[PDB]
Amino acid sequence: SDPSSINGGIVVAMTGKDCVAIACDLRLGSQSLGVSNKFEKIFHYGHVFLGITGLATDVTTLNEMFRYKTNLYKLKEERAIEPETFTQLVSSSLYERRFGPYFVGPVVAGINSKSGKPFIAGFDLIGCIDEAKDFIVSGTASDQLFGMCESLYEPNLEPEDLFETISQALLNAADRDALSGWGAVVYIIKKDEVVKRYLKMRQD
Amino acid sequence: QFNPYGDNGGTILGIAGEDFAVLAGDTRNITDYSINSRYEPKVFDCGDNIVMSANGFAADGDALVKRFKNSVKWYHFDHNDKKLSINSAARNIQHLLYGKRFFPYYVHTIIAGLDEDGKGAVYSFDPVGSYEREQCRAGGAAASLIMPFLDNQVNFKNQYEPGTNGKVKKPLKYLSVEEVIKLVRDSFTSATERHIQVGDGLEILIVTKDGVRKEFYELKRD
Amino acid sequence: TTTLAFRFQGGIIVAVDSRATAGNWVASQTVKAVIEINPFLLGTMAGGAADCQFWETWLGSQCRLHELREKERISVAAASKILSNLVYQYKGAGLSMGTMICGYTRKEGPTIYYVDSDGTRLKGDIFCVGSGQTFAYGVLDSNYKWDLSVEDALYLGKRSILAAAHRDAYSGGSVNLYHVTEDGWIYHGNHDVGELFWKVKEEEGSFNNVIG
Amino acid sequence: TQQPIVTGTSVISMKYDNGVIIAADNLGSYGSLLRFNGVERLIPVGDNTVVGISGDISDMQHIERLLKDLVTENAYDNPLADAEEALEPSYIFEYLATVMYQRRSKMNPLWNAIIVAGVQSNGDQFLRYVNLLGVTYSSPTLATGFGAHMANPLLRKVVDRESDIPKTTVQVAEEAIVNAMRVLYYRDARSSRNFSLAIIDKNTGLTFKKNLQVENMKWDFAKDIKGYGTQK
Amino acid sequence: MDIILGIRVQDSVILASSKAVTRGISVLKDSDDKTRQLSPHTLMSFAGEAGDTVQFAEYIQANIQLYSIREDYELSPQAVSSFVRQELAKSIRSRRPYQVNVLIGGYDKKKNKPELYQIDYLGTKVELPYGAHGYSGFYTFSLLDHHYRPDMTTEEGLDLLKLCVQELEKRMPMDFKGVIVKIVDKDGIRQVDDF
Amino acid sequence: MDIILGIRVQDSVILASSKAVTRGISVLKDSDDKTRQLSPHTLMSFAGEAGDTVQFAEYIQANIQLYSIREDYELSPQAVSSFVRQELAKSIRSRRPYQVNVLIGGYDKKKNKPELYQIDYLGTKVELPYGAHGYSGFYTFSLLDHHYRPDMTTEEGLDLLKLCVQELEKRMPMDFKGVIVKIVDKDGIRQVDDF
Amino acid sequence: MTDRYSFSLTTFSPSGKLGQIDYALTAVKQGVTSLGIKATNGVVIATEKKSSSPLAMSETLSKVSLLTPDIGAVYSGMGPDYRVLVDKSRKVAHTSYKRIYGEYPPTKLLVSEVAKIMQEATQSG
Amino acid sequence: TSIMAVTFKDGVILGADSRTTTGAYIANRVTDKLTRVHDKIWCCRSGSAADTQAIADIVQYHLELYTSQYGTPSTETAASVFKELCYENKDNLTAGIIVAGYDDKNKGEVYTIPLGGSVHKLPYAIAGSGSTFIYGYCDKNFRENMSKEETVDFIKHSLSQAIKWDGSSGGVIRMVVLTAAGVERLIFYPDEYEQL
Amino acid sequence: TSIMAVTFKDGVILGADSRTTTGAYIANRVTDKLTRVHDKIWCCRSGSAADTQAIADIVQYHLELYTSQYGTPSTETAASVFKELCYENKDNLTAGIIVAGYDDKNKGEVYTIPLGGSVHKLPYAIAGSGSTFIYGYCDKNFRENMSKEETVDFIKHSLSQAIKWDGSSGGVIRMVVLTAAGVERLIFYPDEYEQL
Amino acid sequence: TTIVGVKFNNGVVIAADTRSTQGPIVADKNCAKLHRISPKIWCAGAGTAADTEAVTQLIGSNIELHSLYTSREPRVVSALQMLKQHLFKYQGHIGAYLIVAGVDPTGSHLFSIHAHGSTDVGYYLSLGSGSLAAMAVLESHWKQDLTKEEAIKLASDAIQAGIWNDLGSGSNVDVCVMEIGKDAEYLRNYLTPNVREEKQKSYKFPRGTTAVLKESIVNICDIQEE
Ligand SMILES: [Mg+2]
Ligand SMILES: [Mg+2]
Ligand SMILES: [Mg+2]
Ligand SMILES: [Mg+2]
Incomplete structure (x- = not known):
């Protein structure tokens, strides 16, 4: 009944030293029934990464909308969109459906190509921006993620250390949520290289 | 219409060591967005080296603890001052809770102590009496924030030995009382940051063969 | 939760998962869904944790009183009926129970009774109860035979719970196995689903949809 | 199950170095109607305890009778009724707390929020709260209803924790209480200007002050306020 | 509804759909074909609310046939499934939403690969080796999880499908009057007339 | 519920009762016997709410068996049916009523006549040549109205019963997993093991 | 009433000329000189304040206008046409950009929007 | 809320309390409920604060535009504009407005517009939650053609009682006097009116 | 209903209207709401007529039995018996009763027992649906130690206003005077009190 | 949320806490609730955070265009009129509760506005779940003719009351001071009385702790030449 918890799933983003990380589980379900273990919730438009949790049809729809x-932005501006700008676009796009909203929990992650500054942001389903320095969480195990991230996180982690921190935050949060899991992906993002790692986790 | 139940918030945590056990809980009592007390004890020494906490609706929690303490007293009267074992206390609490199956004590109960072999023991109850012996159990408002952390840092879940890449798990080495208290303090510090009902103070009751000891720590008051 | 029990040549196999949930929140991964009524009788836990625990523990007390008074092991028929008649008294009050009372006596042989909080009492060869019951039934129905060996029967029950643990969101944690003989039940260990899944995937070649 | 009819608003209280102070206005509201203007909601029990009650007044009058009966009953076959075996604040509270929880457990509550203020035999300050649900708690400051939201923040600036109690004099505590009552009169629509205040001190005993009024009020600044935006 | 199953094997996609049409008390028909050919190498089965199922399917069929004529070209299964998803995603926030769940089984002639897409009435699309809608998956997925291989032949796929239907006929309370089975491969679409 | 049919022929009463037990999503059993022998020449089939059906049937069985022992005498089918009716009539104005519908098929040894009684959970009793409970009558009564004769043999009764079951298997949405058929005559009660 | 001029008033002549645009350019030619120069660390735009009367306060007439905090505009030709274009340019910088991206448009894109408005007055009815 | 408007010999006086509540919380204790829609046409507002503010602002706009075209509007005209808004939007409004104004031709006039959007021209009017408690007092004590001082006393005493009994009323008593001489604002504090 | 009881120098006077309504229909226009529970202890009834009649009858019984054993009861005692019934049966009653009586020791006393079953001893009390409209008037006009004639005028004027504004009140004004001299019944008709 | 506005001698000050919540969970521990409508017109919002941001930026955008059109600096009464008429039109469905404060050529102003479109004038105002805690402090210490320094102190003290006593409020105190004839000074994190203590333990993992199935480089660059 609650649209934000029919399909399940989670996204988490973190900042590190000259890097950002964003990660998601791979589950798609119809309540109790697991349907897909390959439903990736992170998308990217150039060097800007967007994770989206919530109702899966809206996740797919919003990806297609932001693509x-x-x-069009790139054709007109003759340059790829930046994370700060994209964040405002997501906020604008969501709020224009204020009274018929997409049931989603978006998360933006990326590095400004000019300043080199790491950037993350979160939103509620109608566009309120949460621009945290440390981490952003979203999904059906958001409480669990808040608990993991709050204790595991420390600032200025190196890329390979940040990977371990965010991976463990996701994994253990997902293992305390019935509607999350069935695989996981972690993006480690630096100014001009992005690595994508699939994690091994329990499949129940 | 009259609602006989309420929510006084609070969060509690029980961890069983090899030869000890701890039962911790924040000292904050609330209704809605108001603070009733910054120091209202929630974890109690019930005698016979047993510690107890009934978290949730405080009136039901106080009633249950009061009745259990009374059960300990009468157990001594009726059975020649025999010490009430932690397993026997657990079964007794089940019956106290299930006695009100159709008008429940709106609490999540945890007890801690030592079993009859001197090993650490924690028992966890639902509001209507179903119970189980556990190694690690958080209860109350911030339980969802704490348990995943404990799975990771106590039971070393999802942690593997470097170099093997998932083939060899991190071995489950025994934790000291000092190590456990660190995890308890960090659990409540984190819970205080992210949960509005958690804060003010942390009171920990440690149980060993020597008896019951208390430790108190301040928490953020916002 | 997913629980099953089936009769076969070598007695009864009982297999359960270990997960407990409060909404989407996984409360426990280490719950005991098999209640050891006594050394000869087993009961499964589904629906209300407390209701099942409390009344099946109580059942063991009634079974013990029976054998003291009658100087004879209680029949599974009589044991199951004590429980079903009890919950039938409470019908409408809101008890939640779905259990299999499993036993092996001389007069009856291996026997399973499905007992339920709305008063149902069914004797049967195969039962599956819980949110993941349909997944377990599929593996059971296609592989069940009376002339299964104790080894193959134990695996079938384990594999059927695994099937449920995988697909059902509210089932998982670990698998507990029991084998009920005439001389009593025998515990066949706790099996983490996380480790079991990968092991079964490799050895069996199943779950090709999942990447490992 | 019932609904409160004639009601009393906030009861506020705090500890200080040598005792406790408690206060409550003299109003009995009938919904938005300020029906009864001479209602005493602080009820002393002996010379060491004062029970402050908010909520349903008919239930308050019942509780008042229970306490009166409690004093009578304690004196029966008790040669030390005015000495070692006199009623303590802790006895009076636990009794009320028992009754309140029993009544909520029968789904027929006493629709009240109660604060028992007093000084024990050993001179210790007693201050504990109980309500219609049987919920109990203690704190250096305690307040019911609106007082919980507006008085506590002010009173907690004086006594923020246990260690502030010995540093707080009776003059400072009374001043803080009286100011809080003024703030409640400004902001609580079911409050009155008239109130009662009681001090229970381990040295000077029980001082019960009736017919107090909120004074030193600020209203003059209202003359300059015009319209709701653009009006001049 | 009822029962729409799909399985993607090595060189084809197999769709199995129940034959029963029940209007409350009575079974009005026991030979209903719950499928439409969208293009020569793309088949769509459907289940959901009465009337809306056929209306939606025929509407999609008409649109894909229109595209085929305009461009003299068959859209890929992926392209067709995306079009169908958008139509259903559009439909949920409508005045009156189509309550239709579909499986799209197609053979991509460019990539020489069979493809199975599962789309529910919300517009939730997933590409799968095997799929279902409603309660069908609850009974059949444990069997498919066990026996499925990506290199299965069409005949092995049909045998695994028979096992799924047998389990459904055993444990489902509704009598769905068997299934019509259709195969989609490089040569197009054909019906298995004995099942 | 399910399907409990009864037909009274020349020299016997035949009761047909479905074998399925469904708990919501799954069919838990396909060999359930929804009947109790009250006395050597009296059989009662039943359908209704889970738990209450068997509890009521066994309670009636115990009472009739008690009467049989006390008096060393078998009550007539009419007497048994009246006792059962009163118990159900008592039950409706209870705190929690039994929701149980029954058919009582008996052979009266005194009158040498078969007798079929239909009693619903309200305590509504009727003696009939053929009867049913729930939706069973809706499908079967038109066939019974056409073919029934009071002088039918047991074999003809079984053939007419097969036609009724076939119509049920065709037009009913629920799969009731066939029926167990029992015959009540002067020699007592016996089960037809192939149907 | 109703605007019954739904047809183009600018059309191609046999020679391929769009007369009304050419004539508009002629009006611009008669207009007071304005210029722009780009430097390495800035841009300058300038024009003459051709006061119509010495009694007029030419400070109240702004020929050089702020469009965004980082964009300015000057013109040559018909002053009233310029004024309304500045109003439209300022608004379109918000409606088609700032309210979407939370930042002011780059120079080239704001120019593109102004250009679009001017193009439409060359084809619309 | 306790509001009233009273005609007297030299014109009309509007009176009001200053309490605005959100449940039992006093959101504003110094509210100005006497609002100006024209130089010598004011109104007293009761009901939804959002509604009565929105209405008053629209009326002020209408009378400003009226004045620019046709000169000073009558109090009757102002009441009609209020009524038109309240009546036509009765399904979506909760507004109880008293309109009071001074003409030189018509002198002091008072119109009350209750919930339905009806209009009633009266010698004096009372409204708001607190008015219920002073129907008896006002009926017994009102006289026509009172002096300015008598009318101020009448309003002060009346609203004092309304405030005394109504929890939704309180704070200061604001008054606005409308005569040929001009517009005079008055304010009376608790220490003054509580001892009456 | 409009009811009140007022203490004065020589004792106490109870006053009431005579209107009883079933919705908008006046079921009885000459009702007697002043009821006797003892020689010089009377009460005014408001709320459910069935409830207040049943209560008054039980109280009359209790005070009759009291008198037989312990002699004449006090007005306080009568109020307590009323309170006991109203408080203990608050869930099933809708009764608002004013108790008024004359002792020689205590003189005139008035107790009001509102819906909850609380007791409030007052110099005077008003109750019923019509009382709301005269809280202001009664507060401004009541004095302690009035004469009989002043108290009759006070009640007559007060209930006249309550009747004027409250549709649920009307008919005649009944009064009962309780003094050392005895018990006097008074009645005042519409033509008398409407012109006040 | 706790938000206050306080008038003083030559201007107005507005303050707010920095906790944003998702029910009982703290989403952001250092949220910025002090928003700019125009350079010298600032406001603070409680209620639905998306509504309070959207409505500020919309009116702020239209205020900027109005300022350019009229060649005048924006007025607080304009921001207020535009806000209330917008909010009233949406009948409370836009859950924006704001305290609006600012200076303009007319003088210094302080207003509150509620979601249904009602507005209020005052010398001191509070809003949000901690408004009662804050107002208790304001009613105890507010006086006429406050200085800039006294007003900043009173405002931040009122926010602290909310921080410590309201569970919906916490973390830090933001302040903005708008004085007549001066630039508005935004004081982000004016107070920081809730820094988290050092943890007992480091939770930095050994590298290689997490099990990995696949690694791959993600092509974020555009299609390359040659
Ligand atoms: Mg999981
Ligand atoms: Mg906290
Ligand atoms: Mg699972
Ligand atoms: Mg007042």
Whole structure:
């Protein structure tokens, strides 16, 4: 009944030293029934990464919508969109459906190509921006993620250390949520290289 | 219409060591967005080297603890001052809770102590009496924030030995009382940051063969 | 929760998962869904944790009183009926129970009774109860035979719970196995689903949809 | 199950170095109607305890009778009724707390929020709260209803923790209480200007002050306020 | 509804759909074909609310046939499934939403690969080796999880499908009057007339 | 519920009762016997709410068996049916009523006549040549109205019963997993093991 | 009433000329000189304040206008046409950009929006 | 809320309390409920603060535009504009407005517009939650053609009682006097009116 | 209903209207709401007529039995018996009763027992649906130690206003005077009190 | 949320806490609730955070265009009129509760506005779940003719009351001071009385702790030449 918890799933993003990380589980379900273990919730438009949790049809729809808008942006601006700008676009796009909203929990992650500054941001389903320095969480195990991230996180972690921190935050949070899991992916993002790692986890 | 139940918030945590056990809980009592007390004890020494906490609706929690302490007293009267074992206390509490199956004590109960072999023991109850012996159990408002952390840092879940890449798990080495208290303090410090009902103070009761000891630590008051 | 029990040549196999949930929140991964009524009788836990624990523990007390008074092991028929008649008294009050009372006596042989909080009492060869019951039934129905060996029967029950643990969100944690003989039940260990899944995937070649 | 009819608003209280102070206005409201203007909601029990009650007044009058009966009953076959075996604040509270929880457990509550203020035999300050749900708690400051939201923040600036109690004099505590009552009169629509205040001190005993009024009020600044935005 | 199953094997996609149409008390028909050919190498089965199922399916069929004529070209299964998803995603926030769940089984002639897409009435699309809608998956997925291999032949796929249907006929309370089975491969779409 | 049919022929009463037991999503059993022998020449089939059906049937069985022992005498089918009716009539104005519908098929040894009684959970009793409970009558009564004769043999009764079951298997949405058929005559009660 | 001029008033002549645009350019030619120069660390735009009367306060007439905090505009030709274009340019910088991206448009894109408005007055009815 | 408007010999006086509540919380204890829609046409507002503010602002706009075209509007005209808004939007409004104004031709006039959007021209009017408690007092004590000082005393005493009994009323007593001489604002504090 | 009881120098006077309504229909226009529970202890009834009649009858019984054993009861004692019934049966009653009586020791006393079953001893009390409209008037006009004639005028004027504004009140004004001299019944008709 | 506005001698000050919550969970521990409508017109919002941001930026955008059109600096009464008419039109469905404060050529102003479109004038105001705690402090210490320094102190003290006593409020105190004839000074994290203590333990993992199935480079660059 509650649209934000029919399909399940989680996204988490973190900042480190000259890097950002964003990670998601791979589950898609119809309440109790697991349907897909390959439903990736992180997308990227150039060097800007967007994770989206919530109702899966809206996740897919919003990805297609932001691909649409970032493609036109690039043609007109003659440059790829930045994380700060994209964050405002997500906020604008969500609030224009204020009274018929997409049931989603978006998370933006990326590095400004000009300043080199790491950037993350979160939103509620109608566009309120949460621009945290440390971490952003979203999904059906958001409480669990808040608990993991709050205790495991420390500032200025190196890329390979940040990977371990965010991976463990996701994994153990997902293992305390019925509607999250069935695989996981972690993106480690630096100014001009991005690594994507699939994690091994329990499949129940 | 009259609602006989309320929510006084609070969060509690029980961890069983090899030859000890701890039962911790914050000292904050609330209703809605108000603070009733910054120091209202929630974990109690019930005698016979047993510690108890009934978290949730404080009136039901106080009633249950009061009745259990009374059960300990009468157990001595009726059975020649025999010490009430932690397993026997657990079964007794089940019956106290299930006695009100159709008008429950709106609490999550945890007891801690030592079993009859001197090993650490924690027992966890639902509001209507179902119970189980556990190694690690957080209860109350911030339980969802704490338990995943404990799975990771106590039971070393999802942690593997470097170089093997997932083939060899991190071995489950025994924790000292000092190591456990660190995890308890960090659990409540984190819970205080991210949960509005958690804060003010942390009171820990440690149980060994020597008896019951208390430790108190301040928490953020916002 | 997912629980099953089936009769076969070598007695009864009982297999359960270990997960407990409060909404989406996984409260426990280490719950005991098999209640050891006594050394000869087993009961499964589904629905209300407390209701099942409390009344099946109580059942053991009634079974013990029976054998003291009658100087004879209680039948599974009589033991199951004590429980079903009890919960039938409470019908409408809101008890939640779905259990299999499993035993092996001389007069009856291996026997399973499905007992339920709305008063149902069914004798049967195969039962599956819980949110993941349909997944377990699929593996059971296609592989069940009366002339299964104790080894193969134990694996079938384990594999059927695994099937449920995988697909059902509210089932998982670990698998507990029991084998009920005439001389009593025998525990066949706790099996973490996380480790079991990968082991079964490799050895069996199943779950090709999942990447490992 | 019932609904409160004639009601009393906030009861506020705090500890200080040598005792406790408790206060409550003299109003009995009938919904938005300020029906009864001479209602005493602080009820002394002996010379060491004062029970402050908010909520339903008919239930308050019942509790008042229970306490009166408690004093009578304690004196029966008790040669030390005015000495070692006199009623303590802790006895009076636990009794009320028992009754309140029993009544909520029968789904027929006494629709009240109660604060028992007093000084024990050994001179210790007693201050504990109980309500219609049987919920109990203690704190250096305690307040019911609106007082919980507006008085506590002010009173907690004086006594923020246990160690502030010995540093707080009776003059400072009374001053803080009286100011809080003024703030409640400004901001609580079911409050009155008239109130009662009681001090229970381990040295000077029980001082019960009736017919107090909120004074030194600020209203003059209202003359300059015009319209709701653009009006001049 | 009822029972729409799909399984993608080595060189084909197999769709199995129940034949029963029940209007409350009575079974009005026991030979209903719950499928439409969208293009020569793309088949869509469907289940959901009465009337809306056929209306939606025929509407999609008409649109894909229109595209085929305009461009003289068959859209890939992926392209068709995306079009169908958008239509359902559009439909949920409508005045009156189509309550239709579909499986799209197609053979991509460019990549020489069979493809199975599962889309529910919300517009939730997933590409799968095997899929279902409603309660069908609850009974059949444990069997498919066990026996499925990506290199299965069409005949092995049909045998695994028979085992799924047998389990459904055993444990489902509704009598769905068997299934019509259709195979989608490089040569197009054909019906298995004995099942 | 399910399907409990009764037909009274020349020299016997035949009761047909479905074998399925369904708990919501799954069919837990496909060999359930929804009947109790009250006395050597009296059989009662039943359908209704889970738990209450068997509890009521066994309670009636115990009472009739008690009467049989006390008096060393078998009560007539009419007497048994009246006792059962009163118990159900008593039950409706209870705190929690039994929701149980029954058919009582008996052979009266005094009158040498078969007798079929239909009693619903309200205590509504009727003696009939053929009867049913729930939706069973909706499908079967038109066939019974056409073919029934009071002088039918047991074999003809079984053939007419097969036609009724076939119509049920065709037009009913629920799969009731066939029926167990029992015959009550002068020699007592016996089960037809192939149907 | 109703605007019954739904047809183009600018059309191609046999020679391929769009007369009304050419004539608009002629009006610009008659207008007072304005210029712009780009430097390495800035841009300058300038024009003459051709006061119509010495009694007029030419400070109240702004020929050089702020469009965004980082964009300015000057013109040559018809002053009233410029004024309304500045109003439209300022608004379109918000409606088609700032309210979407939370920042002011780059120079080239704001120019593109102004250009679009001017193009439409060359084809619309 | 306790509001009233009273005609007297030299014109009309509007009176009001200053309490605005959100449940039992006093959100504003110094509210100005006497609002100006024209130089010598004011109103007293009761009901939804959002509604009565929105209405008053629209009326002020209408009378400003009226004045620019047709000169000073009558109090009757102002009441009609209020009524038109309240009546036509009765389903979506909760507004109880008293309109009071001074003409030189018509002198002091008072119109009350209750919930339905009806209009009633009266010698004096009372409204708001606190008015219920002073129907008896006001009926017994009102006289026509009172002096300024008598009318101020009448309003002060009346609202004093309304405030005394109504928890939704309180704070200061604001008054606005409308005569040929001009517009005079008055304020009376608790220490003054509570001892009456 | 409009009811009140007022203490004065020589004792106490109870006053009431005579209107009883079933919705908008006046079921009885000459009702007697002043009821006798003892020789010089009377009460005014408001709320459910069935409830207040049943209560008054039980109280009359209790005070009759009291008198037989312990002699004449006090007005306080009568109020307590009323309170006991109203408080203990608050869930099933809708009764608002004013108790008024004359002792020689205590003289005139008035107790009001509102819906909850609380007791409030007052110099005077008002109750019923019509009382709301005269809280202001009664507070401004009541004095302690009035004469019989002043108290009759005070009640007559007060209930006249309550009747004027409250549709649920009306008919005649009944009064009962309780003094050392005895018990006097008074009645005042519409033509008398409407012109006040 | 706790938000206050306080008038003083030559201007107005507005303050707020920095806790944003998702029910009982703290989403952001250092949220910025002090928003800018125009350079010298600032406001603070309680209620639905998306609504309070959207409505500020919309009116702020229209205020900027209005300022350019009229060649005048924006007025607080304009921001207020535009806000209330917008909010009233949406009948409370836009859950924006704001305290609006600022200086303009007319003088210094302080207003509150509620979601249904009602506005209020005052010398001191509070809003949000900690408004009662804050107002208790304001009613105890507010006086006429406050200095800039006294007003900043009173405002931050009122926010602290909310921080410590309201569970919906916490963390830090933000302040903005708008004085007549001066630039508005935004004082982000004016007070920081809730720094988290050092943890007992480091939770930095050994490298290689997490099990990995696959690694791959993600192509974020565009299609390359040659
Ligand atoms: Mg999981
Ligand atoms: Mg906290
Ligand atoms: Mg699972
Ligand atoms: Mg007042």
